[PDB]
Design a protein around this ligand. Structure first.
Ligand SMILES: [Mg+2]
Ligand SMILES: [Mg+2]
Ligand SMILES: [Mg+2]
Lengths: 71, 52, 113
RNA sequence: CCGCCGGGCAGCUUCCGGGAAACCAAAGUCUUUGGGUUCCGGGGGGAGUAUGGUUGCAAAGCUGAAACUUAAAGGAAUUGACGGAAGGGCACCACCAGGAGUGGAGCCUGCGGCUUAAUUUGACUCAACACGGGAAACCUCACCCGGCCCGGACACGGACAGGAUUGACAGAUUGAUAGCUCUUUCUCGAUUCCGUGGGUGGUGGUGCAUGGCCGUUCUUAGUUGGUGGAGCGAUUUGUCUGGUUAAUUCCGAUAACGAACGAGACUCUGGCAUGCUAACUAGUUACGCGACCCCCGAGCGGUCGGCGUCCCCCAACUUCUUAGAGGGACAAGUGGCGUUCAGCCACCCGAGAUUGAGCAAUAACAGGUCUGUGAUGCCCUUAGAUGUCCGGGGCUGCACGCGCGCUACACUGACUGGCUCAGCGUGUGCCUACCCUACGCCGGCAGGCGCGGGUAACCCGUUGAACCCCAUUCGUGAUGGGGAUCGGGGAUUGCAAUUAUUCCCCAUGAACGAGGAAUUCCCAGUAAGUGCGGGUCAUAAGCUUGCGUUGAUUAAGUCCCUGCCCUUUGUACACACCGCC
């Protein structure tokens, strides 16, 4: 038939990052939780919904996985 | 032929469907007697009420 | 194949058939395909007649090797007595009912009733 | 002439008896082994060679090895099968006698090739080539340039929580508002993820691993058994000289008699049925004509010819329409011809014995088909997946080659008025989003925009067609035929037409003035033309399959070519002459 050469750029299958994720939660002295950064406008993602700094991206993850913006 | 080849022979699949119809004037007995009797094989029966 | 299809063919005749046949096409203890055909009695092989008289039946069979075809094709002797066997005659076949009586030339005579 | 007899040349016939068999009064008398005696063979070639001897004037004659190689060579008969053998018979995929073409041009699309990343691909004489229903933008589609997606069943293992990552609204990007991925993180929450085995598909592979289905040898006449009879027995007759027949179909001769499958009979179909049963989902018919009715027309007026309607109907009926039961047509009569049988031929009455398909045996064939099949053997492949797709692309590409089509070449015709005759279908409202269309306006037209009937014999729809038919131009000019190739617009289908989608409107305006070598098609409502349906369809056909319509010429026989059947025969062929050598 042919036998596939492939231009030597074997594309990455990627991990979605490891991440413990939930350590960064400011417990100021007694039990109370609220940090500030950027926010999403969705309903299931109600006010707590939380954002970022990447090489750009930022995303919100709380209408289960329904609804990540474009920034 | 399934698939291509051989000298081109086709079949000529036919089904007929003759319609008879019979007008009448009766009550709701003579209709419900005459229709329910004389059924059985592959026969479809319609029953129009009146005129249209 | 052998002992089985006889067991069938034996049966279907003994049951009460005008005739019958069985075909077991397909590979049969060899890399090559054979085709086997054990036949018995009478069988018409053309006409409209065929359509309401023979009882054709194809069935595959999927085996630990590959695939054979069965074809059973029985001939119905409802020609003798369906009850009113459809048409009954194979159209070739005419049954002339015989003189039965036709006795006596004799001298004339008469009678009264 | 008629006999006999010896010894000669010969013949037929036979269960002597022989004989592998063919055959043989003798090849008889042979495992029941020997009457006398002469010669001579021991697988085939090498080889009747080498060498030796001898004879010969010599050709040569006579005598006459081996190494080596070799598995059969051979003989008799059997079926085959092929003869540039023979009789018989037959097919318009054969010819004759023709027409139509075809093969020439342009165009269409079928293949070949080249080219091309890609022009996936099956199909290779016939029985591959508008064929795979194969008219493809996207799907199709598999294939390439990419690129996404996972739909990894299942189990077996691994993962309780500082939540296994189920599933993520603005940007980097990317094609994509693909969290498919590079931080952020906010939820479903026992799913998840990672191994292992194992699948699961695959329009992957293999049709010489198969089922079915198909194609065909081949709508050709053939094939088979029971009993007899023949052969030790494979086998053979029955199963055939001849006449016949579309047809081992029949009769008869007849060691065969009577049977079975194919043919035939059958089914569907197609035509005669003022014969029947009927029919507002036919027609209706003609009425009765009761009318409207306008001079629609005739006619002063009575009266009439006539479309339309006013119908309805409680007319009447089946004249055509429809579809049920029926009948008939059956070489049935007569005259030839004929073995005076089987039939054939002519004529009568009348459809003269044949209107046309489907069904189609034994037995075949690496025919074709794995890409019609959730039929599938095995093989591959199996996540980066040949799993399924999105986007695009290709399947359409072009110096050449062939294959089926259409349109022409014109004036028995071209375009310009007009008249006017169907049939088989088909249609909505359908398995997942979708028709058939009547009648209003608008627009030239494509079309557009209005509105109406339609499980239909009602609505489309007296299906209002083309040829055809009739009314004017034209004048034999590559012209007004022809009508390709491009310029430009405008509609429509489609989310999208670039790769002119399809259509219209303009505009350009080609070769072809009858086709070189070949070769298929067929006999009666036949060829041809001619539209029209159906199928293919969102869009849509130059494709087929049906349907009428207009409708010819000519064969009505022969085997002259090609190819088929039987019989006899020959055959070193049995991968069957496309052989063997
Ligand atoms: Mg001897
Ligand atoms: Mg001896
Ligand atoms: Mg020897």
């Amino acid at each position: 038939k042919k036998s596939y050469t492939t231009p030597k750029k074997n594309k990455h299958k990627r991990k979605k990052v490891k991440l413990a994720v939930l350590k960064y939660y400011k417990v100021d002295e007694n039990g109370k939780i609220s940090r500030l950064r950027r926010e999403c406008p969705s309903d299931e993602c109600g006010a707590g919904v939380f954002m970022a700094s990447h090489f750009d991206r930022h995303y919100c993850g709380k209408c289960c996985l329904t609804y990540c913006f474009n920034k | 032929t399934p698939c291509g080849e051989g000298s081109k022979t086709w079949d000529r699949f036919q089904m007929r469907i003759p319609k008879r119809l019979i007008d009448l004037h009766s009550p709701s007995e003579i209709v419900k007697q005459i229709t329910s009797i004389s059924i059985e094989p592959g026969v479809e029966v319609e029953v129009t009420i009146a005129d249209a | 194949v052998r002992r089985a299809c006889y067991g069938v063919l034996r049966f279907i005749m003994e049951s009460g058939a005008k005739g019958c046949e069985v075909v077991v096409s397909g590979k049969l203890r060899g890399q090559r395909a054979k085709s086997m055909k054990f036949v018995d009695g009478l069988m018409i092989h053309s006409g409209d007649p065929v359509n309401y008289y023979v009882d054709t039946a194809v069935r595959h069979v999927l085996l630990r090797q590959g695939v054979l075809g069965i074809k059973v094709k029985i001939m119905l002797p409802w020609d003798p007595t369906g009850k009113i066997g459809p048409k009954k005659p194979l159209p070739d076949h005419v049954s002339i009912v015989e003189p039965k009586d036709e006795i006596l030339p004799t001298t004339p005579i008469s009678e009264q009733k």
